[PDB]
Amino acid sequence: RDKLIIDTDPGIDDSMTILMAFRAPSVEIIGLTTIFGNVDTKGATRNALLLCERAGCPEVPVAEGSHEPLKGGKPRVADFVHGSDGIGNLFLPAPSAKKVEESAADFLINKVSEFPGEVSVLALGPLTNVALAIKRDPSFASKVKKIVVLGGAFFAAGNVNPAAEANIHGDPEAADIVFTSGADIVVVGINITTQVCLTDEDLLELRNSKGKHAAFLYEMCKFYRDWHAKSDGFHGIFLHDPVSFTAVLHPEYFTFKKGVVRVETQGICTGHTLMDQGLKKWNSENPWSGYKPISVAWTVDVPKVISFIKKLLMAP
Amino acid sequence: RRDKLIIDTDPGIDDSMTILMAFRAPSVEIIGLTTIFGNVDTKGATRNALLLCERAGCPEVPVAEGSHEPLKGGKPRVADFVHGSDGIGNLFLPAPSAKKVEESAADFLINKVSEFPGEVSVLALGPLTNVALAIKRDPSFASKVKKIVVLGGAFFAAGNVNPAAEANIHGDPEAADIVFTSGADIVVVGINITTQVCLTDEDLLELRNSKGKHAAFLYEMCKFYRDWHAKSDGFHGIFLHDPVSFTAVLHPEYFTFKKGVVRVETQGICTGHTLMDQGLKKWNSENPWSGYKPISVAWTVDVPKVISFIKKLLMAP
Numbered sequence: 001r002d003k004l005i006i007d008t009d010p011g012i013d014d015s016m017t018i019l020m021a022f023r024a025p026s027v028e029i030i031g032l033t034t035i036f037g038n039v040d041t042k043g044a045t046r047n048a049l050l051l052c053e054r055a056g057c058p059e060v061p062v063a064e065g066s067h068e069p070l071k072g073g074k075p076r077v078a079d080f081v082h083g084s085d086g087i088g089n090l091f092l093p094a095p096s097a098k099k100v101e102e103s104a105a106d107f108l109i110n111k112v113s114e115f116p117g118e119v120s121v122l123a124l125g126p127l128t129n130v131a132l133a134i135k136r137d138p139s140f141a142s143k144v145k146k147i148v149v150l151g152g153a154f155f156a157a158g159n160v161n162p163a164a165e166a167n168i169h170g171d172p173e174a175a176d177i178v179f180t181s182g183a184d185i186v187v188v189g190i191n192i193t194t195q196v197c198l199t200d201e202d203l204l205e206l207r208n209s210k211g212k213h214a215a216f217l218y219e220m221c222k223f224y225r226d227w228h229a230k231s232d233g234f235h236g237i238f239l240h241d242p243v244s245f246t247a248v249l250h251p252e253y254f255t256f257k258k259g260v261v262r263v264e265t266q267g268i269c270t271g272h273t274l275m276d277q278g279l280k281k282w283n284s285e286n287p288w289s290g291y292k293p294i295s296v297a298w299t300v301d302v303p304k305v306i307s308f309i310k311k312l313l314m315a316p
Numbered sequence: 317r318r319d320k321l322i323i324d325t326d327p328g329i330d331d332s333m334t335i336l337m338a339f340r341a342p343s344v345e346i347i348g349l350t351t352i353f354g355n356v357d358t359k360g361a362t363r364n365a366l367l368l369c370e371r372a373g374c375p376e377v378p379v380a381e382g383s384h385e386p387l388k389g390g391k392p393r394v395a396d397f398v399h400g401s402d403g404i405g406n407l408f409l410p411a412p413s414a415k416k417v418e419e420s421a422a423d424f425l426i427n428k429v430s431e432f433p434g435e436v437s438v439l440a441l442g443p444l445t446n447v448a449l450a451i452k453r454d455p456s457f458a459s460k461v462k463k464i465v466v467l468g469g470a471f472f473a474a475g476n477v478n479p480a481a482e483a484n485i486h487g488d489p490e491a492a493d494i495v496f497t498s499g500a501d502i503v504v505v506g507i508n509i510t511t512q513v514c515l516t517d518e519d520l521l522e523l524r525n526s527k528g529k530h531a532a533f534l535y536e537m538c539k540f541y542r543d544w545h546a547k548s549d550g551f552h553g554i555f556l557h558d559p560v561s562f563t564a565v566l567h568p569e570y571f572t573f574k575k576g577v578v579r580v581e582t583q584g585i586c587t588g589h590t591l592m593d594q595g596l597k598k599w600n601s602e603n604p605w606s607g608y609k610p611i612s613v614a615w616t617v618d619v620p621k622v623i624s625f626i627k628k629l630l631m632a633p
């Protein structure tokens with residue numbers, strides 16, 4: 001079993017990913033660390049605690065992270081995508097289980113330091129907790145086995161605005177700290193996730209399936225699917241957080257390009273992710289020179305990724 | 317019925333090929349060359365444009381010297397490692413006899429466009445400083461210009477200055493943003509298009525051995541240009557960038573275009589980055605791409621048709 005920490009802002013697709021991860025036998029979830037984005041940090045914590053209870057694992061630690069990005073100030077949350085409660089306006093009763101005392105940043109440092117080179121981090125939200133861990137412990141990057149990042153848009157339009165994807169836009173400074181940290185990183189951008197979809201027909205197949213959480217998953221997805229229809233004009237949902245989970249377990253379902261990634265932190269392109277493939281020899285140094293490259297998902301085997309996700313979502 | 321054209325340029329090896337092509341094109345009337353920095357300093361660009369008019373047997377064609385620096389200021393660092401110290405591949409030719417006109421490139425653009433409203437097209441082959449100065453000085457310029465075809469930017473593709481930016485836009489980001497948001501009829505030909513259109517070493521030899529009026533001069537300039545492509549891009553030949561934008565003026569049917577708002581990043585690590593909003597996604601709230609008039613971005617190129625048209629003009633006797 002591969003040790004995994006999920007840093008997340010649940011969040012409808014985050015919730016699908018967490019429930020899938022609990023059902024994946026080759027994965028050991030050692031904790032959930034929460035962040036703002038789809039909902040405020042306190043809402044993300046409440047949802048993560050409820051997911052642990054729903055999965056029949058209320059002992060799995062939930063560590064609450066930063067309430068604000070690194071630059072400071074109250075974050076604007078995607079309630080128009082994930083609902084006011086962050087799980088598609090289901091307004092469910094509060095969990096009985098409680099979060100741990102330590103912050104998400106300290107939890108990340110402690111678990112990674114306890115098992116060096118063995119713990120993988122799946123980052124499903126803004127990268128604030130991961131960047132805080134990197135800044136507080138400068139050896140953190142070298143100790144984490146792998147960091148799989150759902151975020152960015154590589155030579156494709158963003159979802160916040162043309163320039164930026166939501167997780168990166170939520171904390172550009174944190175994202176730039178993570179991408180330049182020297183850790184073994186895999187980045188799954190919008191250029192990849194828009195290729196992997198669950199149509200309305202696929203969602204009905206889930207509702208009618210024998211899946212353990214099929215009814216709950218279908219109910220959350222109604223609001224999420226509605227946003228895709230209203231904004232993207234797509235009748236179904238894009239699978240973003242479940243695609244990054246697929247990249248943890250089955251990196252062979254993708255092809256990757258190695259290159260230095262930088263994040264724009266100011267101006268009209270705040271939150272923009274840009275990779276240097278290194279195919280052109282630059283005449284002089286630039287912001288991409290001297291950093292360690294990271295792995296950027298370039299292609300995706302769509303039938304293989306869809307098959308793997310459907311199998312986990314519909315497992316009894 | 318010849319189409320009036322002003323070429324705003326920083327010659328420049330591919331700029332020079334474009335100007336000589338434009339002079340051989342019968343359906344085109346070049347009413348002037350306006351110069352800017354980039355490949356070489358503005359002075360060098362002017363000297364080269366004057367020499368091109370003389371070489372083409374048209375020394376009466378006006379050359380108007382433009383800005384010596386971008387809108388934000390500062391002496392520009394020039395691409396001498398791409399186009400040579402003289403900007404034309406280190407040929408170091410004698411000075412022209414013809415002299416530039418008295419008026420600046422910005423005033424020339426305003427005057428010619430006001431003289432023939434809706435008839436003058438502008439082909440922009442360098443940083444957009446002169447065009448932006450014309451737009452700022454005269455608020456009717458944008459409506460009176462027939463079309464502005466811009467060689468610049470990189471749309472969902474790496475730049476050539478650095479991963480973020482293409483050279484012409486990076487030379488003056490503020491000017492580029494002024495042009496793209498001006499409301500004029502604009503066509504932008506980015507790096508995403510021009511890297512698809514090439515002349516191999518074999519194609520260059522075919523030009524040297526041709527009956528082209530300027531074949532010997534074009535081949536001589538291209539030696540330095542080709543060596544940069546081999547060193548930097550690893551390509552044995554040259555990309556055709558400025559000649560592709562000229563092809564977009566005369567044969568827009570050799571391309572497909574997407575309409576959308578284009579904004580230019582002016583600060584930070586992404587200074588000079590060009591980004592279009594195709595408008596296919598309904599945004600929840602307003603953003604820097606909201607409320608501007610969309611422009612035309614070249615999306616695909618019929619490579620055999622574009623190469624055939626360029627070769628025809630370069631090899632015309």
Ligand SMILES: Nc1ncnc2[nH]cnc12
Pocket residue numbers: 078081159160166231
């Ligand atoms: N379209 C979108 N999808 C997901 N999260 C978002 N946050 C803001 N816009 C978003």
Ligand SMILES: Nc1ncnc2[nH]cnc12
Pocket residue numbers: 283395398476477483548
């Ligand atoms: N490859 C390139 N072509 C033109 N101008 C440049 N300036 C910097 N790199 C350049």
Ligand SMILES: [Ca+2]
Pocket residue numbers: 008009010011013014038124125241
């Ligand atoms: Ca998420």
Ligand SMILES: [Ca+2]
Pocket residue numbers: 325326327328330331355441442558
């Ligand atoms: Ca040029």
